[PDB]
Amino acid sequence: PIYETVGDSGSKTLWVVFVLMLIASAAFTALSWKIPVNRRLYHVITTIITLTAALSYFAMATGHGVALNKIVIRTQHDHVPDTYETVYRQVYYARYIDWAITTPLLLLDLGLLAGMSGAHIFMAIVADLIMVLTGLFAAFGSEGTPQKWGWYTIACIAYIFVVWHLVLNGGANARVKGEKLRSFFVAIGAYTLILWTAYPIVWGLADGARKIGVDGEIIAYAVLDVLAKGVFGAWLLVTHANLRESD
């Protein structure tokens, strides 16, 4: 039986992201002290996002939130019956708990920015929570059974409704707020679209086909997480300071 588990480069990367998330949380706090308490909504939401990711990466960095998945791989043969091999791959379910907190809050950030209504923000979060939930089912679905790729596909469809809702309703609502806000929303929104779209791709390469090892999976999620939480947040909060249209 072959094992696929964290290596040295993966272990260090987890600690790096943990430290990067704390720093972003500190910078965002430092920015928030430059403005009155009543106007700190975005900084509070965005700082909770990076703190949650810090709590998550700290847990994975010290070996928590990980399960060993046993995978049996059936090989077909010409004249001989099928042979079997057994792989044990770490699955970092800590991410599905993190994403269940941070992706709704990211979507709160964008919905507040666009001026979506509370009912519409709520709808995006329902679809988003179905995505990360069925993502978790797919992560524990047995290979060769319908539940693995079937729950994955359901998650992808819930993801498509997120995009569809925010494009149409976030996009129509940002129009009403003027050109400077609308341009910013479209630019940070399009950035988000590209980044979030990469997560199911990493999943297919990792959980799906196991074309990349655990180390490669960890480094890919690290880039995306940093870009989707740290850079995203620094962009939104700095722009907000200079854009009263965001308030």
Residue numbers in the entry: 42 to 288
From the paper:
Type 1 rhodopsins are heptahelical transmembrane (7TM) proteins that covalently bind the retinal chromophore and use the energy of light to perform different biological functions, such as ion pumping, ion channeling, sensoring, and kinase activity. To fill this gap in the current understanding of the proton pumps and to gain insight into the evolution of rhodopsins using a structure-based approach, we performed a structural and functional analysis of the light-driven proton pump LR (Mac) from the pathogenic fungus Leptosphaeria maculans. The first high-resolution structure of fungi rhodopsin and its functional properties reveal the striking similarity of its membrane part to archaeal but not to bacterial rhodopsins. We compare to our knowledge all available structures and sequences of outward light-driven proton pumps and show that eukaryotic and archaeal proton pumps, most likely, share a common ancestor.
Here we present the first high-resolution, at 2.2 Å, crystal structure of a light-driven H+ pump from fungi and elucidate the functional role of the N-terminal region. The crystals belong to the P21 space group and comprise two protomers in an asymmetric unit. LR (residues 42–286), all-trans-retinal (ATR), 19 lipid molecules, and 65 water molecules inside the protein are clearly resolved in the electron-density map, whereas the N- and C-terminal domains lack resolution for 41 and 31 residues, respectively. The LR bundle consists of seven transmembrane helices-TM1–TM7, connected by three intracellular (ICL 1–3) and three extracellular (ECL 1–3) loops, with retinal chromophore covalently attached to the K270 on the TM7. The interior portions of LR and HsBR are virtually identical structurally, and the only major difference is observed at the extracellular sides of these rhodopsins. In the LR structure, the retinal chromophore is fixed in an all-trans conformation. The protonated retinal Schiff base (RSB) points toward the extracellular side and donates a hydrogen bond to the w8 molecule. This arrangement is stabilized by the RSB counterions, D266 and D139, which are counterparts to D212 and D85 in HsBR. Consistent with the prediction, the LR crystal structure contained 8 residues from the N-terminal region (residues 42–49), that aligned with ECL1 and belonged to a 3-stranded antiparallel β-sheet. This N-terminal β-strand strongly interacts with the ECL1 loop and is directly involved in its stabilization through at least 7 hydrogen bonds.
